[PDB]
């Protein structure tokens, strides 16, 4: 029955498929659709045609194995995706037609039904696979019956009757909210229309409008651009993805539907691309500590999933107008154009996709120009996202405190990313694909770049923790300082250290202090754990002298400077120690496989060369101090901390201060209440972490009590001389 629930359904296929968009003289395009042809083919040549088969595909046979029934699924889609693309060789052809409607009927009738109950996953059965079904369907509506749609998505109602909650059959239903929600509309929004059903329609768009409210507690986004989901887990880049990625392709549905969302209400999702998502994208890449346990998938590392953002984004553009829409259009742009490692194509899955990008790229009305330099401190997530367009580097700093988890190990993912969070950071420069090409799974877990730990063997059982201590976050000044801490104490209370970060501009400063060990581990700070480029060899120099690195570590007492220099400048990396220090380096190959971190990974075995720096701690109040400056060249470097001998002001137990004296600029944090005396200029009197700007006789002053997330009149903190 044509009406008007089929114009949205084909409306939803030329958005999931875009067959009508296909044009074969299309590059791009051709591409995609041969992608798809090898898929079908394959999945015709090893489908059972046998009487009484136990399964369809051998490789997804075990139906105790949740994954297998949505792998399954997603199978016949991509037979539905051909059978209805006059370019595919599949084009109406008799056998695909026939196998998509047998197979569904067989995996109806043995598989999966309203008579079932949840085996293994419930994303698999209220997410993964409801959605492949409805998909399957809108696209092949022409050869079903309407009877015959409703019987293969009475399931999903089985499933998935209450629009507000998942795992409605079990034993322990959650509310729906975030990625998730958005999902839920994915799967109702799509059945309701295939079903004809007003209600389940009107009901799941009113249920999906919650996710445009901001919160200020729980899972969600918040004003200051952070994304929490699974309770408290810093979320942005994964969870977000889903939700932003989903959201831009059900709106144009949802909109032509008798129940549109109101357009103020949508309003916050510009608030979520600016303050939430452009932050954590740079050249290209989504920044990993906003992704979670998505960081251990071999298919999803940080350029590709940054697509999945990107198309979401430009989707709402495309339903924007005017300036909105010309500087998203402007945003996508840039962030593509600069990324000289990706083909962002390849995570362009839809012809409509593809052909929205092509225009955006071509359109010479569209600006593009490179993104200006900026600094957020995502507080309520307690990750720090910095980027300098000037000198062209991305820095991103990954913590926790008592208020989120460090890591998230779940389903079998990330099994190793026990100290992803403590104190980690991370720099972006000119080698895009450094954390990409297999960085993950072999990086060495216990080494994590800027975290200090013990030697203890880690289990990949382990799960994540929250911080003991609530004194973790970060004062911003501007959009090139601010100053973060982290009253840190390791996984079994056996180590303490009060981390602290200086970010200045075009450098940033590791100060560490009050380092204590109660175990009998050793303990270390890794400085950095830089995966190398073949291509791009490094040399490098201790105290300016070129220094021969071997697999086998060697120690540098007396260490004032290390500089990795490369052909080209905006790789280099220096790191300045403000009193010479005793630490040790290595260069290695490191072998390991997804599977290593990912049960559900290939065990193929991977190899990357590591450079790895760091400061063992023998005794109780060690310390360590040292200025990362990336971008510059070894003549720069050298002239640079001739600049800032006598930048560090304190490195104590109880204040750590750094001064930029060409900026002006102070970072300070208290552990106490004390007056301290700054430059014999002002005095801070709180706890807390403070990011200060002398211009002339003027203080510009930004404080920020990490404890009670809040701030302070300026005469309670700061006091100046005479
Ligand atoms: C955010 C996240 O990790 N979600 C998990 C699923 O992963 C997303 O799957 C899809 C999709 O449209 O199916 C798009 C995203 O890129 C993925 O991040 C999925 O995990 S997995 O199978 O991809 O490894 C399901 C499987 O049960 O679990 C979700 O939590």
């Not at 992803?420 to 991370?426: A, I």
Request: aromatic content about 10%; hydrophobic content about 30%; charged content about 25%.
């Amino acid at each position: 029955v044509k009406d008007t629930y089929t114009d949205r359904l084909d409306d939803w296929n030329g958005i999931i498929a875009g067959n009508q968009y296909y044009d074969s003289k299309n590059d791009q395009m051709a591409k995609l659709n041969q992608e798809l042809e090898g898929k079908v083919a394959d999945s015709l040549s090893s489908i059972s045609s046998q009487a009484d088969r136990i399964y369809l595909w051998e490789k997804f046979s075990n139906y105790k194995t949740s994954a297998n029934l949505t792998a399954t699924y997603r199978k016949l889609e991509e037979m539905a995706k051909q059978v209805t693309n006059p370019s595919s060789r599949y084009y109406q052809d008799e056998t695909v037609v026939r196998t998509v409607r047998d197979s569904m009927e067989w995996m109806h009738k043995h598989v999966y039904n309203s008579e079932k109950s949840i085996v293994g996953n419930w994303w698999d059965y209220e997410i993964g696979t409801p959605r492949a079904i409805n998909n399957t369907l809108s696209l092949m509506k022409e050869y079903f019956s309407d009877e015959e749609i409703k019987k293969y998505t009475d399931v999903i109602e089985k499933f998935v009757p209450d629009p507000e909650h998942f795992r409605k059959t079990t034993d322990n239903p959650f509310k729906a909210l975030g990625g998730n929600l958005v999902d839920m509309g994915r799967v109702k929004v799509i059945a309701g229309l295939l079903r004809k059903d007003d209600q389940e329609i009107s009901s799941t768009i009113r249920s999906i409008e919650q996710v445009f409210k901001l919160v200020d507690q729980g899972e969600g986004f918040y004003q200051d651009g952070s994304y929490i989901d699974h309770t408290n887990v810093a979320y942005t880049g994964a969870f977000g993805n889903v939700l932003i990625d989903g959201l831009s392709q059900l709106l144009p549905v949802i909109q032509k539907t008798k129940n549109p969302i109101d357009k103020d209400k949508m309003q916050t999702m510009y608030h979520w691309i600016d303050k939430s998502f452009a932050p954590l994208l740079v050249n290209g890449e989504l920044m990993d500590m906003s992704r979670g346990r998505s960081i251990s998938r071999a298919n999803s590392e940080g350029h590709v999933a940054a697509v999945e953002v990107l198309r979401g984004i430009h989707r709402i553009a495309d339903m924007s107008e005017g300036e909105t829409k010309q500087r998203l259009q402007s945003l996508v742009k840039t962030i593509v154009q600069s990324d000289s490692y990706y083909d962002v194509f390849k995570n362009l899955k839809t012809y409509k996709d593809i052909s929205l990008m092509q225009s955006l790229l071509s359109d010479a009305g569209v600006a593009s120009v490179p993104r200006t330099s900026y600094l957020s401190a995502f507080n309520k997530m307690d990750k720090t996202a910095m980027y300098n367009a000037e000198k062209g580097f991305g820095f991103g700093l990954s913590l926790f405190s008592s208020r989120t988890l460090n890591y998230e190990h779940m389903n079998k993912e990330n099994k190793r990313g026990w100290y992803t969070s403590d104190g980690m950071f991370y720099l972006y420069n000119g080698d895009l694909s450094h954390y990409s090409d297999g960085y993950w799974p072999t990086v060495n877990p216990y080494k994590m770049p800027g975290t200090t730990e013990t030697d203890a063997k880690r289990a990949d059982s382990d799960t994540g923790k929250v911080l003991p201590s609530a004194f973790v976050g970060t004062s911003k000044l501007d959009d090139a300082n601010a100053t973060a801490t982290m009253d840190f104490t390791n996984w079994n209370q056996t180590l303490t250290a009060h981390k602290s970060w200086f970010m200045l501009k075009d450098k940033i400063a590791f100060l560490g202090s009050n380092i204590q060990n109660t175990s009998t581990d050793t303990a270390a700070t890794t400085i950095d754990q830089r995966k190398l480029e073949s291509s791009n060899p490094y040399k490098v120099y201790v105290n300016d002298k070129e220094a021969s690195l071997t697999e086998q570590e060697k120690d540098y007492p007396e260490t004032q400077s290390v500089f990795l220099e490369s052909s080209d400048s905006k790789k280099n990396i220096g790191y300045f120690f403000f009193k010479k220090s005793s630490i040790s380096m290595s260069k290695a190959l490191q072998k390991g496989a997804w599977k290593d971190i990912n049960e559900g990974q290939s065990d193929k075995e991977v190899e990357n060369e590591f450079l790895t720096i760091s400061q063992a701690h023998k005794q109780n109040r060690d310390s360590y101090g040292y200025m990362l400056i990336p971008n510059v060249d070894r003549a720069t470097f050298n002239q640079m901390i001739k600049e800032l001998e006598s930048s560090l002001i304190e490195n104590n137990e109880t204040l750590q201060s750094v001064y930029d004296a060409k900026q002006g600029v102070w970072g300070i944090v208290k552990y106490d209440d004390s007056v301290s005396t700054i430059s014999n200029q002002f005095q801070v009197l709180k706890r807390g972490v403070y990011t200060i700007r002398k211009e002339g006789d003027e203080y510009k002053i930004a404080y920020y009590n990490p404890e009670t997330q809040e701030s302070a009149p300026d005469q309670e903190v700061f006091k100046k001389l005479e």
